[PDB]
A paper describes a structure:
CO-dehydrogenase (CODH)–acetyl-coenzyme A synthase (ACS) is an enzyme complex in the reductive acetyl-coenzyme A (acetyl-CoA) pathway that reduces two molecules of CO2 to acetyl-CoA. Finally, the two branches merge through the action of ACS, which catalyses the condensation of CO, the CH3 moiety and CoA to yield acetyl-CoA. ACS binds substrates at cluster A. Cluster A is a [4Fe4S] cluster connected by a cysteine to two Ni atoms that are bridged by two further cysteines. The Ni ion proximal (proximal Ni, Nip) to the [4Fe4S] cluster is the site of catalysis, while the distal Ni ion most probably plays a structural role as its oxidation state is unchanged during catalysis.
Three main species were found in untreated as-isolated CODH–ACS that are denoted wobbly, half-closed and triangle based on the arrangement of the ACS domain. On the wobbly side, the N-terminal ACS domain resembles that of the crystal structure of the open state. The triangle state is an artefact due to the binding of the 6xHis tag to cluster A (Supplementary Discussion). The triangle state was not considered for the ACS conformations as it is not physiologically relevant and is probably an artefact of the interaction of the ACS-6xHis tag with the Nip. The triangle state was not found in the reduced state, which could be due to the reduced affinity of Ni ions to histidine after reduction.
Author numbering:
A (entry chain A): 318 to 736
B (entry chain C): 316 to 736
C (entry chain B): 317 to 736
The structure:
């Protein structure tokens, strides 16, 4: 814990609070007003170090139930600070004030949302304590790169309408930077091991065309973390000793994994799953499995609670996919790795995928359609994907695959067996 | 199969303690709301009972023609040097244990309301009830060579005496029940355990606390304490509440050490107040099972006695096969039906406010406790009206619209597990 | 395992999976349409010539498309360590040391030897002497210690093919009679191949004269022949001592043997019971049996049959539960011949307690299931009592049908119980 004498009710409610309409002190954004929650870098000649101010009415000073602004602007300057340290530093707001209740905040880029609740308004002390806590934590956790920190908490419409421009596109474009950067354009793939607490053997090598299975750490973020902290869990790895571009195995990756994953796993194949895939830790967003009977791939996310054609639901699959065991045929991948060019390149990529939940089809509809159109599979390739309503068993799915002429059936199968 | 050595012409076998009853084919009925019977193990003074006074106060099986209803009140009064008044239910459970899973009369509900349908073949064979109590004398003396001193059986038959015996049983029920709700987790610094279930689940260890009952639904914390007092080297040993590791999630060093010892080191960390992270294992005898649905953001409390589809897409039997045996599966928990009424019912996961689906029978049986707990939690007495049932829908797509229409409070809470994104 | 003689086609491990249709089929040799067979016969050095490909008939380079060439592969071996019992094993190795080359699509064995060669060899100039010399060189490389003189004759004369297939079929009948004669009571030592350990080191298929191995092809005779050829090989005799549970088939000596070559991961072993200490499967298994407490009986499903099952999960789920070297009680992987074995879980009710089987399996075992029912007194009508997918498929479908047809398992002692 943090052990501060704050009034706010210490809890994990910041993550995904869906506030009731009849209680919320502030529900910003929502197609009605601006919204933001931002950490940015400013010049040394226009900011004051240690200043903590709460612009607009305080928590107690206004009655509950209104629709007013909310937002934390943390302006930090240092000698070595760069413009690319925002996405990694700002995430730490989810670990300073996140032991509290009555908030909703994320994604400080160009347009999206921010909120707050009531019951954290009359516990005795004001938001100035929150600002001071944030200033202290930013001065403490990152002493190398920042030398002056200022915090403001705006709650007035006009001063935050300028900030309406700060919650949708910057970080979206920062991951689109991974999208546009090719796998081989860069010359140093980065590592990730922060998930060692649940699975130490997980040494996840992130690439500019393959986000980590956590869904949060990318190559740009790993590089920024290394620049912030050379000793940090993300470490730099050059590319040496090419073995096979088809599966994507180098020498430095293999040696690093062998000497860091406790010698359980030696070789790694970035572009395929059926031979030397990458380990997981239990933080995967989706699960990818092989269906020789359907001759394709099955992808199921965490938020599905139904029956699967393979016969096992997601909860059962996580029992064996995770842990840190190099299992061929099963893997855990993020929901943004599906729309990547190097997504199981050897094993058919997007073509081999057959079945996935309907909700995940809708969420990834546009990107999957774009990726299918890029590869020539046709714009209507998403309709060729069998959903849960179409059939929950292999014997049900196969007639639909025959009807729709799925390309997975047409091409050759994989992983034959012995007698 | 357990055997005996009593000399009676009746057919000892599948027809004396463990099968259903119907009124039409019943020869003589012993119990129910019409001709109530019971079975009590109380404590009385030495002068109140002659040692080994196995009697039959009233007609025997042959002396009664088909048409008359009588009870068999097995009033096993026990006097001892060290016996207490709290030790009654521990032995009282064992009286029907000699013939429960074999012999085939009835024991409805539990405790002291066994219902006996004495067969016509037993009446024709013309035995007596003296040996019925003689069997419960020798076996009782064999099982308890350290507490009991005198054992009696006093089978009454008079209808007014039937009502008097029923009133005595109801008086004893209140004494045995009111103590449990008085206890609390914080009051006592010692927690007992239970490893009786290792016969078909060696890797499973179940921790019992004043508020959390055992998953078997049978033993409580008081029962475990009484068994430890009676059996100092039995399958239950005390553990001091020491070495606190996680206060909110309920983890202690001593509990972790005990589990790491007994559970063959497969389980080392256990949480006493949450399901999604380090849930407690289960033998396979759980009264009910609760699963977490990320789509609905809540708990589905489906019990063993209810057969049917569940929102997760499978019946109780499949979930039991997935969970029981000691497999520590996050997102699923095996609990006793009374544990739902505990004040510390998954406090780390928001408690009763995170329950969205219950079967109709289980919901109706626990209406009285769910309303009382909703009033205490501040959710209001109408909380049971917000809980979906199988009539509302057997699938997520059928109950989610009903849940959002009812404004279930769990929709206003954050999801579970350890966050990463 | 490559070669040296130049061929009109390549030589790689990936050509064994080639797909050739009827239009691309130049001339088949054997299978379900035409007669062709392999053979390995015991000979002496009196009238054998090394590498003599005595092709009696037209060569494969001068045959019209769509024709038929009956192929009799006679193998003449001069071996000091060789015996007449090693003939089948070498035949199996014909599959191993022939498919490594392109165009050598070879399937089945015995009188069902099916080899297909497309026009990629006939049009590009491949002779039958190429095949003969390739087989000779493959036998020399695979078995350099035992063989000394090799003659891979390839008869292609229809009259000679038939009069030689008569000898081959008589030899096959003798092999089958030798398999039938031996029984687990008289035979003291079993064997175990570890070719299946290439994926699951802990797993060890156990092969006995009555209960065949999980692979369904390596019988007791073949394992004994391989041990005689290769004493260092995976198979090792196991003395029959330390009988702990004769009801379910527990021997302490076999338990020690399991300790020896399975990293001591398995303590005991019930050869006649799958519930207590079963044996896992590496995928070589040909069928899966499971226990159903609802009907209290065994269910057996072969690999080729998928779909919904009374146990509640598909065959893929069962394979995942039992395969991968993982030992799970209550389920087992078995070979097809084991169903007809008289040691079929005798303590666990034998054939009586297994009622749910696919109809195709009933048709395959028409001379086996009925014969076993007659042996046990069940009568040939027991197949009517056998639940098949043509009548009932789910638990509820067979719930009243078992009672109507007189289910024997419920009429006998059940297994497994609850707690309270
Ligand atoms: S996704 Fe999680 S486990 Fe994988 S590298 Fe990133 S932090 Fe580590
Ligand atoms: S309820 Fe059952 S499993 Fe739990 S401690 Fe008691 S006997 Fe053991
Ligand atoms: S059945 Fe499988 S594991 Fe056993 S000897 Fe044969 S190939 Fe090896
Ligand atoms: Ni993880
Ligand atoms: Ni139990
Ligand atoms: Ni149990
Ligand atoms: Ni095998
Ligand atoms: Ni196998």
């Amino acid at each position: 814990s943090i052990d501060i004498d704050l009034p706010i009710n210490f809890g994990p409610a910041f993550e995904g609070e869906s506030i009731r309409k009849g209680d919320m002190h502030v529900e910003f954004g929502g197609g009605k007003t601006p919204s933001f929650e931002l950490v940015r870098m400013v010049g040394p000649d226009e900011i004051e170090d240690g200043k903590v101010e709460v612009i607009g009415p305080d928590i107690d000073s206004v009655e509950p139930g209104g629709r007013l602004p909310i937002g934390i602007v943390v302006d930090i300057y240092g000698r070595k600070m760069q413009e690319d340290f925002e996405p990694v530093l700002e995430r730490r707001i989810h670990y300073f004030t996140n032991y509290g209740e009555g908030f909703w905040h994320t994604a400080q880029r160009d347009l999206t949302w921010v909120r707050i609740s009531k019951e954290a308004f009359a516990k005795g002390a004001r938001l100035k304590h929150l600002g001071q806590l944030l200033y202290a934590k930013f001065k403490q956790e990152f002493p190398s790169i920042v030398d002056r920190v200022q915090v403001t908490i705006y709650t007035d419409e006009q001063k935050v309408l300028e900030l309406r421009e700060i919650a949708r596109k910057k970080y979206a474009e920062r991951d689109a930077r991974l999208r546009e950067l090719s796998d081989e354009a860069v010359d140093t793939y980065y590592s990730c091991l922060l998930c060692q607490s649940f699975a130490p053997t997980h040494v996840c090598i992130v690439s500019p065309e393959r986000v980590g299975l956590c869904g949060a750490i990318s190559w740009l973020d790993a590089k920024a973390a290394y620049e912030i902290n050379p000793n940090g869990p993300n470490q730099p790895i050059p590319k040496e000793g090419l073995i096979d571009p088809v599966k994507g195995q180098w020498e430095s990756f293999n040696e690093y994994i062998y000497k860091n994953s406790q010698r359980t796993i030696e070789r790694m194949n970035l572009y395929t799953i059926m031979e030397y895939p990458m380990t997981s830790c239990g933080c995967f967003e989706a699960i990818m499995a092989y269906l020789p009977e359907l001759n394709g791939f099955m992808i199921v996310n965490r938020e599905h609670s139904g029956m699967t054609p393979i016969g096992m639901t997601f909860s059962t699959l996580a029992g064996m996919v995770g842990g840190g065991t190099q299992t061929p045929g099963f893997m855990g991948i993020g929901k943004s790795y599906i729309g990547s060019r190097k997504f199981v390149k050897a094993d058919g990529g997007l073509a081999r995928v057959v079945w996935m939940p309907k909700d995940l089809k809708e969420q990834l509809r546009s990107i999957i359609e774009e990726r299918a159109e890029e590869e020539g599979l046709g714009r209507d390739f998403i309709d060729k994907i069998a959903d849960e309503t179409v059939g929950t068993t292999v014997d049900e799915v196969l007639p639909f695959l025959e009807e729709k002429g799925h390309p997975a059936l047409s091409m050759e199968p994989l992983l034959r067996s012995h007698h």
